[PDB]
């Protein structure tokens, strides 16, 4: 696990053989990570939309471990002010909002 | 409630005598709402920081009802692509991330 929100909900993740930190972000539809080199196929995706769009590489069905939970989901790779775990992967880990 | 994240976590809020909808956003530090007229004192605040800054009006200790929970917290008022409930108010309602 239960994570309170007095601080930013940053967790440890393992992706592409690396250890990283990322923010559990219920306001984000998608997961965006920078400085990861993933193997296998990708296609460009345009995201954002305020001020222009940002182009990232979309990798599908990426194995990723989030705070000890080994899951699979789409990961967008490109420059991001902070690494973000979006709803797409929070559903996979069974993460809910509770009050 | 327990809210799953397959869809955007949009909830009903009551603020300044009005009924609105807003996104429960764990990636946002602050709560930003548009098209509300709040009574009492405010001060300008600069937020964002990508491409420039956005100036909003900061109202402190604002009574707000979020999904049935009457709480108090800072509300920033200004144009926002989507009304956002940030961690500052999610802590007030006792909202946690669970998995």
């Amino acid at each position: 696990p239960q994570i309170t929100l007095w601080q930013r909900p940053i967790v440890t993740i393992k992706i592409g053989g690396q250890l990283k930190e990322a923010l559990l972000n219920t306001g984000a539809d998608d997961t965006v990570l920078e400085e990861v080199n993933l193997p296998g196929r990708w296609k460009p995706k345009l995201i954002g939309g305020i001020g222009g769009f940002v182009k990232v590489r979309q990798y599908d069905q990426v194995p990723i471990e989030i705070c000890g939970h080994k899951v699979i989901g789409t990961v967008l790779v490109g420059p991001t002010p902070t690494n973000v775990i979006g709803r797409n992967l929070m559903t996979q880990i069974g993460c809910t909002l509770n009050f | 409630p327990q809210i799953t994240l397959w869809q955007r976590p949009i909830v009903t809020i009551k603020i300044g005598g009005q009924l609105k909808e807003a996104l429960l956003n764990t990636g946002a530090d602050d709560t930003v709402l548009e098209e509300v007229n709040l009574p009492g004192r405010w001060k300008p605040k600069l937020i964002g920081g990508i491409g420039g800054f956005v100036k909003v009006r900061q109202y402190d200790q604002v009574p707000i009802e979020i999904c049935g929970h009457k709480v108090i917290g800072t509300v920033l008022v200004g144009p926002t692509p989507t009304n956002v409930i940030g961690r500052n108010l999610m802590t007030q309602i006792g909202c946690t991330l669970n998995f």
Binding site: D29, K45, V54 | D29, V84
Partner: peptide, 7 residues
């Protein structure tokens, strides 16, 4: 740094 996001 409030965040959110789409695309």
């Amino acid at each position: 740094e409030t965040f959110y996001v789409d695309g």
